[PDB]
């Protein structure tokens with residue numbers, strides 16, 4: 001299945017997920033709603049929620065509570081973006097100025113706490129202690145990972161950073177609809193694998209398909225492959241740039257190093273094998289359009 | 303009841319609290335690890351987690367999960383403090399304060415859910431959301447001399463009182479106390495939380511004879527500064543109006559203090575706090591007379607004494 005067939009299949013729900021989000025920017029404190037609208041109305045992508053809504057429909061759910069969990073997951077994602085931009089001192093989040101550049105760090109961090117606690121209130125309103133423990137652990141696991149990276153297998157770094165919230169989204173959505181243990185492990189895995197592939201792609205896309213990863217010598221897979229399989233000269237450069245935590249102005253020779261050792265595609269067929277495990281793990285679920293839709297997002301990812 | 307006796311009466315539960323704290327802040331990250339020892343070593347009063355354990359025993363709690371509520375309440379306080387350290391382009395550190403604060407907050411939420419009580423999750427969620435809302439309201443009030451005392455009161459209740467209220471109430475909910483008792487604990491937290499912040503705001507201008515002038519220098523309008531402004535002479539009301547708008551007016555502490563003493567702003571605030579404290583003690587009268595209720599009362603007295 002492809003994009004528009006999914007944008008239309010899931011059109012009604014996602015519209016509700018969208019109203020559910022904006023509905024909670026309720027504060028009497030205007031700065032909260034301002035900064036909120038500013039960041040959630042910048043395009044986004046809505047995959048995590050789309051995965052949430054799909055996971056539910058795929059297991060027979062016919063209610064509208066999956067619309068609320070998908071919405072709170074987006075708020076969570078939103079909150080980590082707000083804090084990440086303050087931490088990474090970013091002034092650009094594709095297109096416009098980050099919330100911090102436009103509102104200030106304080107507001108950005110404080111509004112993200114509002115948004116995160118509100119999502120938490122939304123979960124408690126769902127009354128499932130299991131969804132609460134799964135979700136609270138994933139977010140904490142993310143938070144801890146970010147602290148580690150701050151004071152310093154890179155598949156461990158992205159699992160925590162990205163894959164884990166995907167895992168939670170699909171799984172918790174399943175628990176909420178009242179899925180089966182086999183359907184829960186299935187959905188949970190789809191999320192973990194699609195999340196890993198989502199991130200791998202992302203890192204490979206930072207190298208102009210921006211440029212931030214190298215600028216600060218991030219140990220991404222694309223960069224790590226080039227190092228090992230390139231010339232000792234290209235290899236030395238990449239290595240010191242990482243030890244230096246700075247690869248500014250080293251983009252061209254770096255590319256040449258990749259476009260020669262096939263590091264940029266050795267990374268795509270790494271996310272391609274993760275996207276696979278994802279579609280496989282969905283064997284369990286009942287053959288519904290909702291599933292072939294999930295199967296869709298998997299292929300589209302890479 | 304004296305502070306010395308309050309500390310001994312709760313020494314055991316506070317050891318339970320510290321244990322809970324170290325178990326949770328235990329991590330290989332090293333930065334989170336250091337934070338554990340620093341908290342359980344603090345020479346501070348640590349009144350918030352203390353109100354949580356006291357609350358539970360006051361209503362007959364015989365288990366020991368009240369110690370976890372005490373621990374998560376201090377994590378919440380600690381987390382809000384870290385985030386309050388974030389500096390704008392008015393430029394530990396931003397990265398550290400934000401990320402460590404995030405680890406702490408998220409861990410408290412984990413601890414909340416471990417208690418297995420949706421009702422407790424209902425009350426804490428709101429509180430942290432309200433604390434967060436109140437923090438942003440305070441951000442907006444910086445350099446604004448025209449906030450009503452309603453706004454200001456909503457601020458102290460929001461950023462301080464609400465946690466005290468939640469601590470007290472959740473311990474009672476956990477102890478399965480009765481509605482009347484819960485509402486009494488609940489109110490006691492609110493009022494004491496309020497008194498606690500009013501004493502704090504006025505002390506920011508005097509006492510001990512960090513340091514006075516901070517709130518003034520930050521252009522942060524607190525009850526006493528606002529009161530002097532609305533009750534002082536026009537010249538004084540203009541200087542205080544300018545000090546809030548411009549900031550960096552720590553050098554105006556003396557003149558401001560004179561404006562305050564002139565209309566009784568400081569005493570007027572202490573008065574209002576002592577009044578909030580009595581109201582907190584009134585709420586507790588609906589609880590069985592016990593040594594723990596005596597301790598809760600002592601804390602209300604100590605919070606406003608001079």
Ligand SMILES: C=C(C)CCOP(=O)(O)OP(=O)(O)O
Pocket residue numbers: 043044045046047048077162199202
């Ligand atoms: C690795 C992550 C967290 C960034 C990409 O995810 P998203 O595609 O969901 O980000 P946005 O669309 O919201 O900018």
